[PDB]
Structure 1
């Protein structure tokens, strides 16, 4: 029936693009996961290094009393 194959059309087009919008999110999100994935590249960097500077700080201070 035309009322079926037709309703199907407007429904499928309202099914694919319904994924479009969703697809757009995976686009932006993915672009953000990598974007914010940069800060972590610095976090890991800073953290360990911050421990290096502090470690040298706790050492000198201890030897400054001995």
Structure 2
């Protein structure tokens, strides 16, 4: 037993504890990544709207004012 048994048990238990902590960390990380993905998705649309609005407005107003 002696060193053999003591190393066996202690190292095994410590390894298991560390593995469990890693498990928890990764679950939380994945949830955070999901939420951020949805925020990015919502930003994209509001950027496209603004692009179309500005382009159309500038074009039309320029034409109208030059014609006047």
- TM-score band, normalised by shorter chain: 0.7 to 0.9
Q: Which moved more, 1:52-61 or 1:26-35?
A: 52-61
How far apart are 1:33 and its partner, in Å?
A: 0.4
Residue ranges of structure 1 left out of the alignment (5+ in a row) = none
**Root-mean-square deviation over aligned CA pairs:** 1.5
TM-score, structure 1 as length reference = 0.81
Structure 1 ranges of 4+ moved more than 2 A: none
State the SS of the aligned residue for 2:65.
Answer: coil
The number of aligned residues is 66
How far off is 1:45 after superposition? 1.2
Which runs of 5 or more residues in structure 2 are unaligned? none
